[PDB]
Structure 1
Amino acid sequence: AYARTLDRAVEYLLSCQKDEGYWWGPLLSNVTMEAEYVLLCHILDRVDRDRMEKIRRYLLHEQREDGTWALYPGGPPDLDTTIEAYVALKYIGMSRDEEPMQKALRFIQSQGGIESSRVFTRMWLALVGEYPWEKVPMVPPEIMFLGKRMPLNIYEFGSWARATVVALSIVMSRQPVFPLPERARVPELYETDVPPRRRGAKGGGGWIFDALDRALHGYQKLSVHPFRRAAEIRALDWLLERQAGDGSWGGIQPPWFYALIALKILDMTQHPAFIKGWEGLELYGVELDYGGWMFQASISPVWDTGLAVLALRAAGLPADHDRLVKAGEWLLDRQITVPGDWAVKRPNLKPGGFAFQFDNVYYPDVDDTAVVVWALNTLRLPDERRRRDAMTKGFRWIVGMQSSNGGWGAYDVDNTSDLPNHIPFCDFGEVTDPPSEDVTAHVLECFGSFGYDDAWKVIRRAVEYLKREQKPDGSWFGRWGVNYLYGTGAVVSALKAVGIDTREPYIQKALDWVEQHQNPDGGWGEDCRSYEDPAYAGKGASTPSQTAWALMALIAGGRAESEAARRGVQYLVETQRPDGGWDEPYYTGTGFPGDFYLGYTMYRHVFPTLALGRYKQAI
């Protein structure tokens, strides 16, 4: 039955593979990337009229009937996203009258306008002079003086926020303004009666930071700030030391863009770092068929390659299939052998992890490292001592990265501080990188492949962690993927691999929860709204990936031969396209719960393949 569905899915993956041997699907997010890119170009005085065009097309193409833009497809109109898109389009050259602008503008106003937007949106507008710099939370370069062990030192922030903070402190120190030509100034963002419904800091704001901010805005007013040049230079140097190979910073949009502006501020456009940083941008860009251009929030070659391999293997292809071997070889050249920012908490730990992007040595993450190492462990490569060696370094690093509670974060160890989550500036997404169920799960299944089990103390501490984190209804939160189906799917698949007994209560209680949210059409789905409203947990239009996930949990928990299980497999078999792939107009990936979602282009092909390979395995 499904066999053909599977052989067709395989043939498709293999065709999607690149020459070098890796897989790489585009990462989808929202228009703030392109919108900011446009403003970035304006700031750097590097506007390509041709690019603007492809961008206007993209922006419009993404706008909805109501004239708004959301974070995920089929999501509520988002104010911030729409404001930035609005400003972007007006700059590119669109009359504030035209249908699109008008509809959007009304929505912006019906919300309290500019004043109801996140800090970043006001800060970007601040940069082009459409908003007072003094109404923007302040982050001083002096932050660079806080030692390793001090509240709010840059190492208490998550890897992603850290770099952004540093780059920003330089910018907010100079508070520069790059005026927009008159034709694009957007005062009409203030023209509203609705009261500003301002979003506060993540975990609530102590009157302390509130005061401290005001203090900092005052200190900014002075005519002489002692030791500030030093603080700046200490930040510029922090930046220069970490610039990634592709010229980015952390391989993510934010710090990259800010670091570039910061360098512009410091009159270093003639410097290598800037040139390389500016040039690197193109690699993240994407030409869309309908004539548009989009910029990726980040790139996922390694991650894609890793999963693709695991999929194709669990699906059939021999451990030495020349096509997989090509990938295995590629993955080895990716391993990172130098110290990163994690070393600040594990100085005696030898490097051996992998990153998400192509070249980003200072930020390997536990999630990738585990998937890659695990993937390798399922291949038969020529240089068997290199494969055997890589795995060990990777394995040991993961082990050494395990946090206190027994789980694993993504980039750092015990990056569980809470202080940063309260400062004014941080009102968007996560700011710290504490252990998560999904990452911890992947780590467990990775070890599991090697044979390790519940006897080893490391695994136990982890399992205890997952047990304590389980949700009342037996589900598990999905930190880096939408959502409860993603996490529950991971956890169960893992626990089954580390020896745990699937017949246990909590395991069963989870399995049940899965069967219970099966959509009528056979498959499962879970809308991104499940991060905001608990009523959506498990609910949503069925998607190939989310179906595959719930399907893995069922297969892992022994319920392979089940109604729900048979039903799910059917769904994937029917919904499959003639070429072998699958479609998925929804996002199933999570950047920050409730604030930023991603669309992993390969998920729709890889996971269904992996799940089918596991079904065919359980028979």
Structure 2
Amino acid sequence: AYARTLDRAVEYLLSCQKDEGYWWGPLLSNVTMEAEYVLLCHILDRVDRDRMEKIRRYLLHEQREDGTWALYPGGPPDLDTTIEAYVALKYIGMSRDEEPMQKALRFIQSQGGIESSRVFTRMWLALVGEYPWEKVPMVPPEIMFLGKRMPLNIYEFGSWARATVVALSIVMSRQPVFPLPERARVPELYETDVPPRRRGAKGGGGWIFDALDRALHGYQKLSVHPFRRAAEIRALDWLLERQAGDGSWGGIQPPWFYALIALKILDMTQHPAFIKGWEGLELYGVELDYGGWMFQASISPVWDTGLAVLALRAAGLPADHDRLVKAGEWLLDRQITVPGDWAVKRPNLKPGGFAFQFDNVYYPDVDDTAVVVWALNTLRLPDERRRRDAMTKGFRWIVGMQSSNGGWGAYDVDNTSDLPNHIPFCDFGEVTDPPSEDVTAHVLECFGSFGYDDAWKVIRRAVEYLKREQKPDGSWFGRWGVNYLYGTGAVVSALKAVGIDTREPYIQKALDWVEQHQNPDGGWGEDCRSYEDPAYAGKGASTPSQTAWALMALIAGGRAESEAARRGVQYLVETQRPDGGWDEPYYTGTGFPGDFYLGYTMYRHVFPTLALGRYKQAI
């Protein structure tokens, strides 16, 4: 029955693999990427008429009937995302008269206009001269003077936010303005009677910071800022030292873009760092068959490759399958061997982790590391030497990354400060990188493959962490994946691996929860709204990935030979395409709960296969 499904799913994944021997599916987000890119080109004075076209088709194509744009497909209209898309289009050529512009402008005004947008949005508009810098949260270069152990030092923020802060400190230090031609001016973003509904700091704002900010803007108007020069250089150098091999900065859109602007401000357009940083952008771009063009918020070659292997293995292919070997080999040349920012908290820890993208040595993450090591432990490479050695290095690194609460973070250790969550500037997405259930789970299952059970203290500490985090309904939150089905599926699958007794109460209470949300069509689904409204927790249209996750939870809990079990398997078998793939018009990935969502292209093919592979194991 499901056999043909697997066989078809397998040959498909094998056809997606590149020559080098890795997998790499595009990462979807929202139009703010492309929109901001347009503004960036304007800033760097490097506009390409041809590209603009492709970007225009894209923007319109992603606009809904109401004339707005959302964070995820089928999601509510987003003000910020729309405002930025509006500005972008108008710059390219669109006239405020054309319908697309009209319906968009409407929604924008019905929300209070630009005064209701996030910080970044107002900041970008400030860079082009459509908004006063004075009304933008200030972030001084002096922040570079804070010591390793001081309130608000760059190392208390998340790896992703850190670089951004450093880059912007230079930008906000000079508060440059790159005027837009008259035809592009967007004053209409102000014309609104609706009261401005501003968004506050993530964890709430304190009058202290509020005052401090007001002070900073004041100190900004003075005629002399002692030691500011040094502060700027401190930031410039910080950036120059961590620039990624591909020319990026962290492998993410934000810091990369701001770093370039910063360099432009310091008249360093003819400096290697800049040149490389600029031309490196193309690698993240993507040509769309309908004439459009998009910019990936980030790339997941390693991540995809890793899962893809574990999927094909659990499917059936030999541990020494010549094709899977290519992957193994490839994955070995990716391992990092130099210290990263994580070393600031673990100076005596030996490098050995892996990154999300191709070349990003200074920012390896636990999640990727775990999956890559785990994936290798299931293969038979020609040179058992480096394979054995590699796993060892990565293994140890992961262990040394374990936080205090026994849980694991993504990039840093005990990065659980709370101060940054109250700063005026931080009002969008996460700002810190605390331990998460999903990451932890992946780690445990990684060790499990080796054998390390509940006996080992490290494992126990983690298990306890998970137990204390479990939700009342017996489910587990999903940090980097949408959502409770993602997390619960991870935990259970992990706990099962570490030797824990699947018969346990809290465990069962979880499995039951899964079955209770199985949609009528036999599959599982969870809309991204589950991050805003708890009512959607476990609710949503059925998707190949989410269905596979909830499926793994059951197969792991022994309920593989159950009704809901076989039921879900039926879904995957039917919904499968003639080529052996799967479709998924919805996002199942998460960047920042309630603020940024991702669309993992490979998920729809990988997980479904991994699930069917594990189901064929229970029988």
Distance 1:553 1:424 in 2: 41
Distance 1:364 1:613 in 2: 29
Distance 1:121 1:198 in 2: 12
Q: Deviation at 1:65?
A: 0.4
Q: Deviation at 1:410?
A: 0.1
Distance 2:583 2:250 in 1: 30
Q: Secondary structure at the match of 1:309?
A: helix
Q: Deviations over 1:230-284 (max 9, x none)?
A: 0000000000000000000000000000000000000000000000000100000
Q: Deviation at 1:595?
A: 0.2
Q: Deviations over 1:397-433 (max 9, x none)?
A: 0000000000000000000000001000000000000
Q: Secondary structure at the match of 1:125?
A: helix
Q: Deviation at 1:480?
A: 0.1
Distance 1:208 1:21 in 2: 54
Q: Deviations over 1:359-410 (max 9, x none)?
A: 0000000000000000000000001010000000000000000000000000
Distance 1:131 1:505 in 2: 57
Q: Secondary structure at the match of 2:172?
A: helix
Q: Deviations over 1:313-363 (max 9, x none)?
A: 000000000000000000000000000000000000000000000000000
Question: In the alignment, does 2:605 pair up with 1:609?
Answer: no
Distance 2:140 2:182 in 1: 31
Distance 1:272 1:279 in 2: 11
What is aligned with 1:450? 450
Q: Among the aligned pairs, what percent are the same residue? A: 100
Q: Deviations over 1:522-566 (max 9, x none)?
A: 000000000000000000000000000000000000000111000
Q: Secondary structure at the match of 1:598?
A: strand
Q: Deviation at 1:185?
A: 0.5
Distance 1:383 1:43 in 2: 50
Q: Deviation at 1:47?
A: 0.2
Q: Give the RMSD, CA atoms, in angstroms.
A: 0.2
Q: Deviation at 1:68?
A: 0.2
Q: Deviations over 1:124-175 (max 9, x none)?
A: 0000000000000000000000000000000000000000000000000000
Distance 1:290 1:188 in 2: 31
Distance 1:407 1:573 in 2: 36
Q: Deviation at 1:213?
A: 0.3
Distance 1:150 1:85 in 2: 39
Q: Deviations over 1:487-530 (max 9, x none)?
A: 00000000000000000000000000000000000000000000
Q: Secondary structure at the match of 2:294?
A: strand
Distance 2:185 2:365 in 1: 41
Q: Deviation at 1:441?
A: 0.2
What is aligned with 1:124? 124
Q: Deviation at 1:50?
A: 0.2
Q: Deviations over 1:568-596 (max 9, x none)?
A: 00000000000000000000000000000
Distance 1:528 1:97 in 2: 33
Q: Secondary structure at the match of 2:559?
A: coil
Distance 1:181 1:327 in 2: 50
Q: TM-score, normalised by structure 2?
A: 1.00
Q: Deviation at 1:99?
A: 0.6
Q: Secondary structure at the match of 2:560?
A: coil
Distance 1:425 1:76 in 2: 24
Name segments (4+ residues, structure 1) moved above 3 Å: none
Q: Deviation at 1:78?
A: 0.1
Distance 1:25 1:12 in 2: 13
Q: Secondary structure at the match of 2:195?
A: coil
Q: Deviation at 1:451?
A: 0.4
Q: Secondary structure at the match of 1:214?
A: helix
Distance 2:2 2:465 in 1: 37
Q: Deviations over 1:98-142 (max 9, x none)?
A: 010000000000000000000000000000000000000000000
Distance 1:187 1:223 in 2: 31
Distance 1:228 1:135 in 2: 21
Distance 2:569 2:432 in 1: 38
Q: Secondary structure at the match of 2:590?
A: strand
Question: In the alignment, does 2:169 pair up with 1:148?
Answer: no
Q: Secondary structure at the match of 2:416?
A: coil
Q: Secondary structure at the match of 1:617?
A: helix
Q: Deviations over 1:429-472 (max 9, x none)?
A: 00000000000000000000000000000000000000000000
What is aligned with 2:36? 36
Distance 2:459 2:246 in 1: 36
Between the two proteins, the alignment pairs up a number of residues equal to 619
Distance 2:112 2:103 in 1: 15
Q: Deviation at 1:61?
A: 0.2
What is aligned with 1:133? 133
Q: Deviation at 1:8?
A: 0.2
Q: Secondary structure at the match of 1:276?
A: helix
Distance 2:384 2:221 in 1: 63
Q: Secondary structure at the match of 1:245?
A: coil
Distance 1:181 1:464 in 2: 59
Q: Secondary structure at the match of 2:462?
A: helix
What is aligned with 1:361? 361
Distance 2:596 2:217 in 1: 29
What is aligned with 2:415? 415
Q: Secondary structure at the match of 1:616?
A: helix
Q: Secondary structure at the match of 2:591?
A: strand
Q: Deviation at 1:73?
A: 0.1
Q: Secondary structure at the match of 1:249?
A: coil
Q: Secondary structure at the match of 1:477?
A: coil
Distance 1:449 1:182 in 2: 62
Distance 1:612 1:425 in 2: 46
What is aligned with 1:58? 58
Q: Deviation at 1:219?
A: 0.2
Q: Deviation at 1:21?
A: 0.3
Q: Deviation at 1:478?
A: 0.1
Distance 1:330 1:387 in 2: 11
Distance 1:192 1:469 in 2: 45
Distance 1:307 1:397 in 2: 20
Distance 1:81 1:331 in 2: 36
Q: Deviations over 1:54-112 (max 9, x none)?
A: 00000000000000000000000000000000000000011000010000000000000
Q: Deviation at 1:181?
A: 0.5
